[PDB]
Amino acid sequence: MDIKYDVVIVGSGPIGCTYARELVGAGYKVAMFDIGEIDSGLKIGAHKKNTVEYQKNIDKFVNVIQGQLMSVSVPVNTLVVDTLSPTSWQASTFFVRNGSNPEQDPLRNLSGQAVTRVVGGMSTHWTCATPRFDREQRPLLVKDDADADDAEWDRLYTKAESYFQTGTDQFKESIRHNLVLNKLTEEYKGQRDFQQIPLAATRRSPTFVEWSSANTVFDLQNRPNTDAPEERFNLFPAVACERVVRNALNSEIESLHIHDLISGDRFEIKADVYVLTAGAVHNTQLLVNSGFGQLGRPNPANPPELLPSLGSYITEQSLVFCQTVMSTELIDSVKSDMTIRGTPGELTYSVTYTPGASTNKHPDWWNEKVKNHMMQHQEDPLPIPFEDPEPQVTTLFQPSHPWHTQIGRDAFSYGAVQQSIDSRLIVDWRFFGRTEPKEENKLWFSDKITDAYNMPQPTFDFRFPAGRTSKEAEDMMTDMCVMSAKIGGFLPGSLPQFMEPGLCLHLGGTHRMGFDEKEDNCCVNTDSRVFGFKNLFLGGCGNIPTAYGANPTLTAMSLAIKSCEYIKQNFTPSPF
Amino acid sequence: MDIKYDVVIVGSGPIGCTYARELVGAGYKVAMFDIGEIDSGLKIGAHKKNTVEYQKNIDKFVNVIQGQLMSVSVPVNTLVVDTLSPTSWQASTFFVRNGSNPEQDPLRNLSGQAVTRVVGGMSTHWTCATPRFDREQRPLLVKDDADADDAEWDRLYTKAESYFQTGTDQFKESIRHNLVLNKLTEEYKGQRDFQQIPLAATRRSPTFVEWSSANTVFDLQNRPNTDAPEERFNLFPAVACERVVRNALNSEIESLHIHDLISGDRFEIKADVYVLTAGAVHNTQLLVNSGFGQLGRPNPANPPELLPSLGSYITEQSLVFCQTVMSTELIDSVKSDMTIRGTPGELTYSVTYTPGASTNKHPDWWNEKVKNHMMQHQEDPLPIPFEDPEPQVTTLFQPSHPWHTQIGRDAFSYGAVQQSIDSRLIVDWRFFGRTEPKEENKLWFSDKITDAYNMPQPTFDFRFPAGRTSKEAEDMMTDMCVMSAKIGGFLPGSLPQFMEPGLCLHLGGTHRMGFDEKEDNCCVNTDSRVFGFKNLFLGGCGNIPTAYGANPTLTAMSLAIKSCEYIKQNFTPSPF
Amino acid sequence: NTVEYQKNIDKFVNVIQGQLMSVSVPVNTLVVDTLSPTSWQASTFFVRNGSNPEQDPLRNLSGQAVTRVVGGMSTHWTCATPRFDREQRP
Amino acid sequence: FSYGAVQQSIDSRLIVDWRFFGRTEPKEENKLWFSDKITDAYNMPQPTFDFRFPAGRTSKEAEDMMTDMCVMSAKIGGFLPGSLPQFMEP
Ligand SMILES: *Cc1cc2c(cc1C)Nc1c([nH]c(=O)[nH]c1=O)N2C[C@H](O)[C@H](O)[C@H](O)COP(=O)(O)OP(=O)(O)OC[C@H]1O[C@@H](n2cnc3c(N)ncnc32)[C@H](O)[C@@H]1O
Ligand SMILES: *Cc1cc2c(cc1C)Nc1c([nH]c(=O)[nH]c1=O)N2C[C@H](O)[C@H](O)[C@H](O)COP(=O)(O)OP(=O)(O)OC[C@H]1O[C@@H](n2cnc3c(N)ncnc32)[C@H](O)[C@@H]1O
Ligand SMILES: *Cc1cc2c(cc1C)Nc1c([nH]c(=O)[nH]c1=O)N2C[C@H](O)[C@H](O)[C@H](O)COP(=O)(O)OP(=O)(O)OC[C@H]1O[C@@H](n2cnc3c(N)ncnc32)[C@H](O)[C@@H]1O
Ligand SMILES: OC[C@H]1O[C@@H](O)[C@H](F)[C@@H](O)[C@H]1O
Ligand SMILES: OC[C@H]1O[C@@H](O)[C@H](F)[C@@H](O)[C@H]1O
Ligand SMILES: OC[C@H]1O[C@@H](O)[C@H](F)[C@@H](O)[C@H]1O
Ligand SMILES: OC[C@H]1O[C@H](O)[C@H](F)[C@@H](O)[C@H]1O
Ligand SMILES: OC[C@H]1O[C@H](O)[C@H](F)[C@@H](O)[C@H]1O
């Protein structure tokens, strides 16, 4: 470690790695710090799902996700346990216990909010869904010229998709995928369009997908090295970034205070450029601990002087979930082209089809798979082949249905995964609502209470706003019930429900972007530069100032690419 | 990869790494294959608990364990779900679904048996408890000379303890530890002795412990390298070892068939010496797939000709569990030396003690911690300091109490971890019973059904034997109820219970050791050599032929050290 | 119709459940394998606890129940008495 | 006749129950029969059902009816956790 770099990056998630990719590549001397540690294998920051073992046992991966989602703010617990032995010690009050945050109103929380501290951030376990936002969900990057704005976003999203290896063809030969997609597209037709979920992933074989991650964006190997002898990069894991140091004028950052969590030593690191990509909660925390905004419970009688919108206007999405069991209609449809005679398991049983009958509903490759499976596995009553991939189906957000949808199988199962129903029958439904930004919806940091890293404790003051946001959330639940029923009935144990607020982990608006600090009530401009500072940039979903339903990361990445263009335009690398 | 090594090792767990440590160190050309992948960070095969983040959030680590425990044999599920929508497809029978093994009698199973396929094996997530076995639990290594047997085991265990960095002093300054230990030792006195659990671990600070693993034994870095320029070792992850190839006479192994799970290619590797350390289930599987023992449902009318005891006499331990909530007696005892005046939170409140009163029950360092905590945290009603380490207490197996005990806090929590009761009050109790080896208790491999790696499906035919084993298991449950009550009453949600058979993951006896193949009904001799073979060795708990209650790994390691002495005595390394 | 039930209507569910006796219960096949090793266990899912061995569990009306008390089920019914329109009516 | 545990956290004045009842096509194959071997608690032939909801109109309407209750209920409020939309035991 040196005390001087060209660029310092706080966070090794996929947005920090967008900045590394762009800037290491442009010749800057870059250091990247992460509070978490390398724990994905020799491909640093890679997706934990990419082992042979997880892809042969995908039901286990939920546990890996749960193992690295550490709750942001837990209220004081008030459950009465009165079946204790009379000899057992019991307090006479519900006192502050077990890491609970006494500041947190339990009824104004995002209880499902969690953070991940590992090299690669949440991209080590994410679903890899990377939809574009349509105009309605998307911040403006050019004002008063919609066609130039569209052009700019197209160029940026195209680049982000290339970084993440986004595609829409990885599941095209799945029977289950097709079954679900084809049905939905017929029943709306074509008042809504359905497609494969855009996924940051490359299929390597019929049974293995290489899911993308931070590592796909930037490999996180120190440089110079043999592949990149004229580049300069260092990754420092297990280093808590605590404070950026402001000048008097609030026009420049003059250093970064860091804490080596192994040795315990503290240092101060100097950079020409400072990029905070610590996630939506933790960027905010680091800024509040550095004197931006206000520490402590918000107090209107003494509003913050520096970035007063920081931590206000926060957005998190409503999320509804169920699972379904495939209808008899759809299961029978799989084998609709077959002539089936006799009874499974007996001498006379056969299943045949005629390749190329124009009468066939399905093409030959489908009927071949189905025939083979039915004849070779007469003990099995379903016509779906055993290793058939899951559906990965969406109808994207539109004005008439202003929610994102993901229909398929998600590794992040909620609750006990029941084993009685055959998994080929099971389809997951997740619908994500957009949330209006509102000044009263805040993330703030205690002046008394600290987290496990001795940093000010995060506290939410949040409710879904009462008008359009809440109306749409309920409409969205209805929509998922109506849409799901086209495929099948609900799976007991996975009935339609709202998930805990913030379990969707799409928190935005915490350090939000706009044109004008005061008029747009925002913290960073369209280059992701903090207002008034020459050399401080924020990357991540916390920049998104709009009400959005789609998964935000591709949009956050796009904003980062644009930020890096600004840096390349205004800062000169040091000589090698 | 070469097609020729001096020694090939199948498995990178702590027993394979014992063989690597001994033999790489002795100058052999070693290759090690593991079916699983590197996923613990840059320290290959290291304990996953050793991140700063897990040790600040230890309640999350249960999920990491659950994420890599893949069930051995799951029976066909027969639960009736009859609240499905009438449109949903339903079969008319409980058919073979969702990876279930149709061979497995659900009532003769070890349902909690699981395997871990990752570099470092189960040592990437284990509790690190490494007790010695006393004579009563321990196989004989010398016959008819008890003092020479004791000497041999002492030397071997001392070496194994040095490899694992076993100690008994890591928790000596915990208030909770002391509270529990001191109470139990008074109440039995001294008809039973209590001590700290021997743990393979080194404390680095008051809040961080470096837990040992396979990596502690052998660092698993390829050699030659800068630290070890004259050593030769290669680790090949994601390589399924499928078969060892026997000569006609069954006197030598002539190669190892391997399957590269990334490329899909198959190869055959030649070694002077072959060591199978794939765990108790999977060593057996590999052997049955190579023509040892018998494939298919056991058939007494056609007993196996080659190693007929392989897969018979299997042992797994009964495990009882509860948690308790610390008694008022014991909580009051913590502060027994304090003079406490007024009421917490008010101006007059104070807590004082007199250092060195001979009347004090506790020494000054205890009273200091307690006083400071009480005065500095008057909102907290407990006298235990917030970062106080957990107890780690045992009374080892003895004739009058023939079970192992671990009393403390274990990361591998069973069930939902309730948050209402303060965690400083909570103590876990696990008691482990010894199981009589019995011919009828088998692990066998289907001739029809295969696992996820296309290898014969493991199937258990197991019941706890009806006489002494079952009698002791129930006595052991009673013992834990009686002993636990000295500390506190049971925690609702963690009432005393037997865990699922095989959840303790101490399976032994699958390829068991003895002096004489026929007379001792065994598979390997005291050098861990397979009877009749010159060049095949088996390492692991599957060698242990006795009824044991203590955690077996240190004993398995000891047997491996002795095996490696035999190899060093009989095989010459190739020139460098 | 007691004063007490109408002041505590949440308790009345228990009165209903107390007189709904299941018509046909299939043989139970749930595996309970956390029994003490000393406890007696059969080696099959045998006919137990009033189960009907004739009943295919997957072709059942598991929630069917009968009430044997003077007044029959009208001693606990909801008292909803709609007419059928032509379409539903013999 | 509440189904399941009656949660006490939500004020009861807020809570509204929804029950929707579907019509079932009569079908010869749907039977109630009586064992010639097994008897009930009164020594009378044991009742046994051989019943499935018929696969065409009955099942189609049942699922439509579930959708209807979800759409209609949402006019009043959102679902109560623990009482999510479900089919009851047949
Ligand atoms: C956990 C999760 C996440 C997503 C979905 C699934 C699940 C279960 N799936 C999903 C997501 N997003 C999508 O667009 N589509 C998908 O299908 N998920 C969210 C996505 O995963 C996040 O939006 C994305 O990673 C955010 O990227 P980031 O802004 O780079 O932030 P990260 O949280 O990934 O990484 C931040 C990083 O910084 C560190 N850190 C935090 N504090 C500090 C301090 N003080 N000093 C130094 N470093 C710090 C972290 O440890 C972390 O690695
Ligand atoms: C999971 C667990 C394990 C233990 C306890 C806690 C928990 C939750 N705690 C405990 C244990 N043992 C103790 O003595 N004290 C403790 O406090 N646990 C058990 C211990 O962890 C095991 O006994 C030990 O690792 C066994 O060592 P091993 O004999 O080296 O076996 P492993 O299972 O660790 O590693 C084997 C290895 O081989 C691989 N493999 C399997 N099949 C193949 C094939 N066919 N080809 C190639 N490689 C193969 C694995 O992937 C694995 O890494
Ligand atoms: C239990 C239930 C019932 C109804 C609803 C609510 C609940 C929880 N609410 C409901 C009902 N019906 C409606 O139209 N609207 C409502 O809102 N329920 C059903 C209604 O309760 C029944 O349809 C009605 O009682 C049937 O009347 P019934 O045909 O007279 O039959 P019962 O079952 O009431 O009484 C029969 C009776 O005969 C006896 N018995 C049976 N076997 C014998 C033999 N072998 N020998 C002599 N006597 C016998 C019984 O003991 C019983 O009293
Ligand atoms: O299974 C019931 C469903 O059947 C379908 O085939 C329809 F598309 C849905 O609208 C719904 O009527
Ligand atoms: O709390 C009840 C317990 O109290 C104790 O202090 C004893 F040691 C136990 O034997 C039991 O009597
Ligand atoms: O709360 C959402 C609901 O609001 C209502 O007032 C409507 F009547 C429903 O259709 C639905 O939109
Ligand atoms: O449960 C949370 C997740 O659900 C799905 O995987 C989404 F794709 C993620 O972005 C995230 O919201
Ligand atoms: O739950 C299984 C574990 O319990 C405890 O951690 C033991 F130490 C382990 O060896 C293992 O049995």
Residue numbers in the entry:
A (entry chain A), B (entry chain A): 43 to 618
C (entry chain A): 92 to 181
D (entry chain A): 454 to 543
How is this structure described in the published paper?
In this context, Trametes multicolor pyranose 2-oxidase (TmP2O; EC 1.1.3.10; for a review, see) is of interest since it can oxidize both β-D-Glc and β-D-Gal to the corresponding 2-keto sugars, which are intermediates for production of D-fructose and D-tagatose. TmP2O is a homotetrameric enzyme produced by lignocellulolytic fungi and has been assigned a role in lignin degradation.
The H450G/V546C variant combines the two mutations H450G and V546C, which individually promotes Gal turnover. In H450G and H450G/V546C, the His450 side chain is absent, and similar steric hindrance does not exist. That H450G and H450G/V546C show identical stabilization of the α-anomeric configuration of 2FGlc and 2FGal (3-oxidation mode of Glc and Gal), while V546C does not, supports that this is a unique property of introducing the His450→Gly replacement, and independent of the mutation at position 546. We therefore do not expect the α-anomer of Gal to significantly influence the rate of establishing the productive 2-oxidation binding mode.
